[PDB]
Amino acid sequence: AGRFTKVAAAVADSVVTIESVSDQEGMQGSGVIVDGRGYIVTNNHVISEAANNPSQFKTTVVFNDGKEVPANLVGRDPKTDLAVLKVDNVDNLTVARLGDSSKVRVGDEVLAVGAPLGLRSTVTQGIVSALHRPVPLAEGSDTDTVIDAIQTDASINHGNSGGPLIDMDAQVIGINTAGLGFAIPVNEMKLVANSLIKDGKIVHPTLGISTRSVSNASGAQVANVKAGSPAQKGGILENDVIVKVGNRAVADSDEFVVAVRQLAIGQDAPIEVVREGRHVTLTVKPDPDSTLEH
Amino acid sequence: AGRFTKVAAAVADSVVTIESVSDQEGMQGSGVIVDGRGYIVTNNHVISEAANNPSQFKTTVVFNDGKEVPANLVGRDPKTDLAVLKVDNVDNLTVARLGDSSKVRVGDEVLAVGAPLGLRSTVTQGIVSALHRPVPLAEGSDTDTVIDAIQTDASINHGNSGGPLIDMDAQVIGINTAGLGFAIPVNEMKLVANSLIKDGKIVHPTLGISTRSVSNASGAQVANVKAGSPAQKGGILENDVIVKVGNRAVADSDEFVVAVRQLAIGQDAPIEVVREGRHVTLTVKPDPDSTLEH
Amino acid sequence: AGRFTKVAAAVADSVVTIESVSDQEGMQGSGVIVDGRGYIVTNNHVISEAANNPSQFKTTVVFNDGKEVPANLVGRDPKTDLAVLKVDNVDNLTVARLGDSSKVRVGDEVLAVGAPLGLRSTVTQGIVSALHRPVPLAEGSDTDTVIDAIQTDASINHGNSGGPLIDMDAQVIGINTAGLGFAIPVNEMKLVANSLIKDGKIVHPTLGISTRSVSNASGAQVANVKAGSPAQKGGILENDVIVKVGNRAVADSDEFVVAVRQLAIGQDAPIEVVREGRHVTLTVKPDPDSTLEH
């Protein structure tokens, strides 16, 4: 057996098809069995329409064996493009073995595994091209987001979106997201899913800032400040060039969005800014984007 | 020597350039020496224009050594995008070693080898991403078709189209077709070529049905039924959702076309249909698409 | 450590980021430390705008450690898309180990390495798909060119353009150029850079000929002959189909441009032509495209 063939076969049992059907729409993606009690992680855009119209759509899981099982949405996060599904009382589940995406290195050989029984599913091979790479993700009603992705030259497409990005120990180091390829790191998936399973929601910090990238005074230039926002109270203004959020240098508006989310909610943080040519440090206390889930 | 370098060099002698030239057009593709008597398999779209205008076009083979030889069309099949050429009385031919595409597995490392002396030929590397994958192929006068392809993330382009998809034992498991990459499986190539060499034609079954895909009652929905067709006599109607042809579940119009061709010609077969919401099984006897070659 | 991970880490110290910033523009690419005295080779389009507007742009190198250093343009060649930069009095430089691109073979495994600290840098993996492959390159004020590239199915993009194409001995066999992927061979880079370091310019031969490709009397068909050119004095005319320049058969206008540059400047050379259907050989003495640098 080939060296990638063994790795793809060993994890095929842990990968499932995810299907959302209505009266005149049937939607598919891949997923990953992360808990033996029937918890399956996919990405939020695979199930986005069903979660936004739950009265008309129906979600099912098709396992490697062909077994079709009803599935229920535990929670979802458009901001990380993640989601958790639950299948109830399904036995002998092969739980995916989850790696540590902080031990992933550029050049590591990876497989982007799709649902073994999906309609036009794919299994692609490549290497890790970039780590901690901010990428904007576009969906339906949800709003666009940015994530620190693992980048890979393994192709990420409709046929493996939501499936796992696998290392050569058959461990999950990421969740593929097709909507030059990108994966959500597994350590971020572990956090987001640990809170979607418990709370059915994840709470991210906000500052009320919309930026545009600038490079010449490079960084994320403030396009608008929400009234009453933590940036209102911190003293951040328009035309400001944000160059550091917390302990993270901000290269552009993509790294800004990701640097805000690595801040502590409700805890003072420094924001370094170049204003009219003058280096100004500012203090901000991030709000929870969901006040009543916090 | 590298592990892919050895494999690509060992099969370079079995790959040829195929050139079709006229007064104001010169066309190229790759090909594969499959028989020591001078039989060369390419795909039908490489030679499509020359076969449709044989009075104005001229086809030649350029071997790995540089030898140019005249070539004559034995037969071709737009339905599988395959074709056979013949070079006469050329000695010391290195015949490609042909594999068994039913022993191919997802994750298998492959090379998509192009003509070693072609104009802008390529040799690409990847894995098998999907097996038994129906793909529509678009040509000139010929009509579009669908095939169960091997899917690969090795790039399939103009520079290796018609060349072999090679496994790590230097065996041909497929024929590359550029007109995310797809190859005709070798076991299907062996069948189609075994009949093009003998008969100069291949005969495929037909039912007289044109479908469109539906997914919500998913399958291939009948758009039109030819009068007097086997579907006329079987009782298949319009707005019917074909969900199984023979022993093969039909996911969409792509899998329909491929499932019809795996039927026995002139032998009763069951067609399962969802009509106005009612599961109706129907019997059909497939016609030969070429009555006087059958 | 993975087999590509070790190779990418071992050369990460020899790869740098190259940044050209002005008042309202900031430009990035990758580069390669080729000499311990501070010589860095990139491709010409990374620095094209800064070299054409040196009063407004500022170029810097960011090393693997994070050290930012000012950089000065030693020379550049839009015709090979190459360029040399110099950092002065920077110590403990890890000099890239340079391979021999004439010992590169189709199927060789390669890494297209980008700047380890670049904005959206990539490291991609693949094989050598084609050797001695003429490719047109498009820039700003510079004029388009054609080069004998190494072709690779490793992705060549903005994030590794200007960085090295690396073999499995961690040796540079090419310079990546994003503006299916292509690299300038290292042996051609060695020549062009050896003359840009000494002379701050490279001198290429010219004949005063503009061609268009023809294939039916295939080759490079003469579209225009410059008055007083070496082609004026050699007797080359319009509508001529150039089929060989020197010791190199010319398949099209791409191979023509590359075959002219492999001629000796100021030394008689044969040009084989098909004129009105008649094979005519002609003699030409190539001019230096830069008379006062020659």
Swiss-Prot record, chains A, B, C:
The active site is at H45, D81, S161. Essential protein that may act as a regulatory protease that is conditionally activated upon appropriate environmental triggers. Keywords: Cell inner membrane, Cell membrane, Hydrolase, Membrane, Protease, Serine protease, Transmembrane, Transmembrane helix. Belongs to the peptidase S1C family. Its main location: membrane. The periplasmic region consists of a protease domain (PD) and a PDZ domain, connected by a ten-residue linker. Interactions between the PDZ domain and the catalytic domain lead to an inactive conformation. GO terms for molecular function: serine-type endopeptidase activity. It is a single-pass membrane protein. GO terms for cellular component: peptidoglycan-based cell wall; plasma membrane. It is found in: Cell inner membrane. This is Probable serine protease HtrA1. Residues 191-250 form the PDZ domain. It is an enzyme of class 3 (hydrolase). The C-terminal region exhibits both monomeric and trimeric forms in solution. It comes from Mycobacterium tuberculosis (strain ATCC 25618 / H37Rv). Its EC number is 3.4.21.107. GO terms for biological process: proteolysis. It catalyses: Acts on substrates that are at least partially unfolded. The cleavage site P1 residue is normally between a pair of hydrophobic residues, such as Val-|-Val. Residues 1-291 are periplasmic.
